[PDB]
Symmetry: D2
Subunit: 254 residues, 4 copies
């Protein structure tokens, strides 16, 4: 039983009384993994003891770190020093990351928030006929150099929850003209970013966020001007998405 404090009504929770480290016991790790599946994004404040090697070793307890170049003295640590567009991380590849662990090193005095959206709540709130349509759709994601076909709805490998898989890397919905694709995307993506499905975090140096990349999107707010902002992320390797009918994503260009 962790000290868990929900931040918004439908997503997000701060976990208190825990100091992250490469030496956490299996029970704390398990309770972290469960809070993560349930809340989609979790927050840990005052992790000021943490450093590059230590963040990477903590990460190792949650899954297998994977390269996205990297921070020096590390194998896996990525620095961001602006991602102000809604997106799920790396969906242009087949088995994109399952989770990301992000630590604030330098935090602007004003601005520099991050927002997450719960794509499983977004799916559940759709009227039934629209869920049934979403269940059937496939989208081409691209970093334009990769192009991957993913189902629009993914069945979460642990919870079994269905979640929308959309975001900035989507180039089009397969089977549809450009105009129709744009309208279908706008409806479904509009439900992901509806404010009720989101939580916004104001960072302080030493804050750590971990989110389930299988069931969120996120957005870094670029309102901080020339104030320094440095964050460091470890990303954890994920599985091939499974659609509602059991079909699997497939990379189609490389």
């Amino acid at each position: 039983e962790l000290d868990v404090h929900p931040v918004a009504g439908r997503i997000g929770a701060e976990i208190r009384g825990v100091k992250l480290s490469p030496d956490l016991d299996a029970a704390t790790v398990e309770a972290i993994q469960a809070a993560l599946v349930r809340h989609k994004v979790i927050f840990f404040r005052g992790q000021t003891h943490l450093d590059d090697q230590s963040q990477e070793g903590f990460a190792k307890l949650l899954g297998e770190p994977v390269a996205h170049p990297v921070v020096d003295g590390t194998r896996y640590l990525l620095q961001l020093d602006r991602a102000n567009s809604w997106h799920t991380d790396v969906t242009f590849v087949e088995a994109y990351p399952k989770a990301s662990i992000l630590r604030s090193v330098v935090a602007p005095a004003s601005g520099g928030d991050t927002v997450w959206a719960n794509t499983a709540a977004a799916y559940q709130e759709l009227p039934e006929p629209l869920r049934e349509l979403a269940d059937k759709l496939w989208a081409v994601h691209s970093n334009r150099v990769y192009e991957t076909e993913h189902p629009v709805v993914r069945v979460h490998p642990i919870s079994g929850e269905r979640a929308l898989q959309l975001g900035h890397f989507v180039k089009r919905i397969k089977g549809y003209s450009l105009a129709d694709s744009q309208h279908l995307f706008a409806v479904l993506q509009g439900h992901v970013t509806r404010l009720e499905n989101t939580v916004r975090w104001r960072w302080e140096a030493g804050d750590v966020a971990i989110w389930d990349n299988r069931a969120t999107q996120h957005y870094a707010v670029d309102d901080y001007g020339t104030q320094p902002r440095i964050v460091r992320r470890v990303t954890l390797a994920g599985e091939v998405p499974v659609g509602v009918d059991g079909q699997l994503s497939r990379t189609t260009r490389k």
Copy 2:
């Protein structure tokens, strides 16, 4: 066997060698009714003998004329002397007209066309998952004083063909926010008005058009300035629309 000449690839046919009148035989009438179901809109040129009473008596052979005020010396004849918005006639009511018979009395030397769209071809061309969604949708039509709920897809009482029922009188798709309704309408209505599904007619005095209002929309082009344009229409009473599941439209405000 009428002399039938298709005008566009997917809708519209001119019928030659026939002089419309209140005295046409059951066979000619039947062959006209069939060309109408098949082609959605049919055209008869050189009907210069026709007049108000005679148009009304011809109409009587095709169904039951119904008031939409009316042209004098007639019970049913409506004059239009500008409908430049895509629409199916009177869908704000439950049992809107099944067909309309329109005669050109004064025809601009340039401009003043009418265009029809085949809403059955529009339905058939949708990808299957989108047809399945359309099969489930209901829309509120309104003359804002009536409000009627119609299924978005109507099963044609004679052909059994499914056709989209949308157009200018739709206020919203029931069950959806305003934003989502607007996107869903734009996709489905965009397929109705796609040029391939339409036929445009340039009028000459004495031209007569008859169209199946259960499976078209139409639009009067307002490009003729102050050139006189007078047309006279008789409209024929229609049935209550049946949806794919057998549900019936219902007026909900009066």
Copy 3:
């Protein structure tokens, strides 16, 4: 005075500390509050648990003239009338344990960030606002104190005057999408005793409805405002 002012987001919103609101604040404090408000668009005071209905109304009276009349849709208060409120003062009486946030958007920053050709078009537009009263307001208002131009849009807008429905919808979507762009907003998570005051001339706001059946009770005093002036000096007008 120099107030203890702590900006919340980069382009809007500031918490003011070391002030206990009351009907007895001095002219200097009230002036410094009015200035922070103009500057930051929405300002927050925490720990105002001594405050009550009568006391909120008396404090409000120092900032302007109070005026009689789940909001999860972006809006500027009462823009369906001619001289809609200049400001609102909102106190949290009961705050849900999770959810129940309010977001504000800075419509002056939204205007300034438009490319120049787009700002010029905005400066010419008028919109019809309605509570279906119907009032015509300029899409761009010149703020009577700062002279800052701000977009006047939101949920009460029925159409942009002089355009087809389709064009109106596209034009509204561009300008309103700038207002609600995350960069121009601030989200506040309420605690009982928090008070927010915002400049209704240069914001919109949205009450997030993510708290289910948790109790939530807030009390608002609204302050009377002026008739909007457009960039060319024309005035808003009620038409129905």
Copy 4:
């Protein structure tokens, strides 16, 4: 000359009778054709069954300099290059019995009908056209003969320069929706031997793909055009 000219739709398109096209037309006829073209945007000659490949090319040569390089999408020909064609001459060799029409839109009428604030914004926009060559063209072109302003948009447009993707899409949808509004268009049903010539500086067109496997064969000569000039006198420029 005074040609026998019969307008097809109210705002674009005219059939010219009593003329048999050929490489031997006199300067007066050619001038009167050039004038009808400028005025009506697209002109039609029926019954040109004597014409053949060599004869079409020779006739074309009287109207400008010929230039080497199912189109059911609205477009202006080759706008992905700097000096795209000023005109095209198109002959129907085989015409399907039903379907196979072509539609043209008058982009000068589309510009003129915009409300004034919208025309002013259009006069400032630039767009990137691409055949994915990438060329920057002004959204509004000043026609080198008539001085008429016309919208330069259509299927080759990738984005409006200086705007986000979402804004670009809204702005393109408003301006392009005016181009394709039915009132600004004319649809021609072809017969073998019909010839259409259009002013590619002030139109778009669309070939309707409703004829299935019916044979359809058309032959086009295209005439070289100038670099577009915007309202401020800037020039289009290829950038990739």
